[model samples]
Target chain A: SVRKILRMGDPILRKISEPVTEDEIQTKEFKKLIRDMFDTMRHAEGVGLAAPQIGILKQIVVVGSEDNERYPGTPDVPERIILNPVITPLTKDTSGFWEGCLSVPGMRGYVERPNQIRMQWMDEKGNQFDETIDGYKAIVYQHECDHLQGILYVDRLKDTKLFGFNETLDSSHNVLD
Target chain B: SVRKILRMGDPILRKISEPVTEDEIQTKEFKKLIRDMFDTMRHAEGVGLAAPQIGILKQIVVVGSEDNERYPGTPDVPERIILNPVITPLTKDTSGFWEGCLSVPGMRGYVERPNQIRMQWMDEKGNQFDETIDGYKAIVYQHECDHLQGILYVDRLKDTKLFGFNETLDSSHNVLD
Candidate 1:
């Protein structure tokens, strides 16, 4: 899988994408794009990734739960891809949990979410399918879906007053092992 | 302040009376228990009663949130009370919400709450005081404070699975009308 090189300033980060065109999907460029999305999500230490985050629109997402330190109790996921998804009967049973995003860099907030969800979508191969996820898997689906609406996981934080980022590095770097 | 009426067959429902030695607060007997507990929950209608349900270790609870179909958006409060309460905090920064009481009736799940709480108990004279709460308020403080222990209102659900008690009857009555 390829990797998207992201930096401090990328207009694609703020832009909402238009519907994906056929030429874009059929081209070899999109194939590499999808591969790179998976690579980026994994390299970025994120459980899921949206196409728009990588400068593409047209409803594409890659979700997997292999080894993510961020989501403590994330359920095991082999691997899966979704294209042009439609979330029907999205459960609104909300529970607040802290989450951080690669797009936003280094900040976490209490995000409210439904504990379960059911959705339908197409695979990269254009095969239509449906899936129902509960617990953390459901959380990932919702997080990725937020991108489709031009929304980020940060947008779901109901109580922004409590948001904070834990400092990763201390000014005093001890040399002793 | 009234004594609670513990509901039927519940473990804590049958606890015997323990007399309050304090002189300043008004005395509560069996009859006042049901009325007073109801007052605190805005008519939650619990059937069981335990002394601790009323904030007293003596054991009491009431159950009967039936008959009264609480509308989600409506602000209807009919009953609440406080008495001889002592609490100790077990955890911090850990909130949860799911509770049920032997005193209160029925199975209501998935209530929510703050992680830590300090509760002060006041004797009938309203003079005595002690406080603390955390973790699974399901059968403890989170369930015990601000209302009956593990009662329906412990964390009254913000979203409910609407189940009309007499959908057929109500519709038929409308036809006759």
Candidate 2:
């Protein structure tokens, strides 16, 4: 099932999510839903998503590309599930990347986030892992992580003036991120 | 099952299709394939499609948006199955639209096609239809009808210079059609 992603201004997207218990990870409902998240994100052509975006009030974020299981023509993907996560910035240095969201269609904004970080979370199998991520990859986790705390990429815009329609910005010089 | 759309350069896309007999429309296989075409077209986010693009060398072209039987989040659709279609130009005038194809991802071309036409085709229940279509709707049939003839939108580019990457064209002021 490809779940519908809630867009910006949806009250559900602004609500904080609860941590998923380890016992909940192996439940049939949980597996089905987490897989649905992957399917939904992949179908929506999004690289990151928080469970809250789908009206699920659980601190689960999925990142990276997934196999288009419905359409086999797609890919070799190593999509990951991160539950009950923790993230820490390793550096104050930031990089500017134009960010777009499934929750924010058409509108795009320049967002700067710390380019180095460490993250810890549990996978679908309930196994824990801690990893150091840098550059663009780290930015992905931070963006998705913010959703658990009821934040959107638009809230982190480098300048509100930098935000506009994808069509309008493309007309000038910036290619959509 | 959502079938994979054959992109440009696939030899199968170049071959002529065998016209589906009226008796074939009610068969279990044709119904299943027709439904799959709808699924593939919907999943591909395309408004029209040809059976030949999915390796089914049959005279089938489906048009309009279909209900997302998979995702409940989309549509008010009256998708039509057009078999053995015949299109007649009603005017010499042409309209330019930036055309993009599921088969030709990333590229877009400004195409000028007669935007007024008449079409005759058979429905799924073996009922015949002959109707006049004008403006943007007419361009859709000609485009999908050309696929049945193994032709792609690139062949209809108004000028080679007007065609480029969608990203490139999106720059320098041309809204995608």
Candidate 3:
């Protein structure tokens, strides 16, 4: 089933998605959850998905992007599932990015993030990897990961002047202008 | 970590334990939860456990008995894990059993249940199961399953005469008389 994604004002979005365990992977029910997540993400035209957005307090993330003219110069991310992830910034250097969220729809926020990051996480096969990621994917990963920590891009907005509805912020709707 | 079991009077115990999704099974964190449950159950000397007993709203139940010396004639029950269980009573006939709860401590209540039951649930392997359970195990399953529905054995007390504390019950301690 395609679960309803919760919005910003919902209390559940404000709560943490705790750690995912190894035992949960073997359950036949959990795979269906991942399936439903992907289906819901596509139906919503989202670049990624988090378990908490669907009301489960689990640190499961599904990320990938389709090439889009909606936001120019956007990077396409190969679909990946991240579980029990831990990430660290590799640099203080950053340029701001205009971001939108599935939960915080219709609004845009300009948030600055580290230009590079080092992260450790498990894959769908329960294998671990450590990698340094940069560019727009870094920006998107940080944005999606924040939901698991009870955070939203709005919480890290560059300034109030830089935040508004898509229709209200003509330049921001273009994002790169 | 061994989680603290919520007691009666705690509003969480009164809340329903919703279905356990197939997705939660393979999580590494979920396995830890099961281990903690067994640890907590043994520490509490309980015959069974429900996820709601520890403040989680998942319909997970753990059951068994170790041959009690304190409560005579109590049959031994092999340990079993029941997830997302659906049980149907096979008969209307009941012989009341005096019951005690870890959640509702220092209290005993008389509750009557059908002598046999048919249940469909999942095991630890994510495999499906359907079984007919009878005798003391059947009664215990019914009692444990009640917690998933937010019902306590105290809610099933047959009468005031059949209820009291361990130190307080006279011939009622035996309940057979």
The candidate maximizing TM-score is 3
What are the per-residue Cα lDDT tens digits for candidate 3 across A1-177?
A: 789887664556667888877888767788998898888887877888889989888988988778743355687778888888777999999878878888766656678999899888887788888999898878878888888887878678665345545544543232233
Candidates ranked by lDDT:
2, 3, 1
Candidate 3 lDDT, tens digit per residue, B128-153? 88999898888888988888987888
CA-based DockQ, model 2: 0.01
Q: Over the stretch B1-177, how does candidate 1's per-residue lDDT look in tens digits?
A: 444433322223223334344552355563365456556443444333335544554423333233334656322322233454444444444443334443333333345555666666553444655545444332344444423333333124432221111332234236534
Q: Could you tell me the lDDT of residue B158 within candidate 2?
A: 73
Q: In terms of TM-score, how similar is model 3 to the real structure?
A: 0.48
Candidate 2 Cα misplacement greater than 4 A, ranges? A66-77, A174-177, B1-177
Please give the C-alpha DockQ score of model 1. Answer: 0.01
Q: Where does model 1 exceed 4 Å of error?
A: A1-11, A21-26, A168-177, B1-177
- i-RMSD of all predictions: 22.7, 18.3, 24.9
Can you write out model 2's per-residue Cα lDDT over B24-142, one digit (the tens) per residue?
A: 99899999999999888988878788999888888899878545332233343457889998899988999887777766655566789987899998988999999997776687789
TM-score of each: 0.44, 0.47, 0.48
TM-score of chain B of 2: 0.88
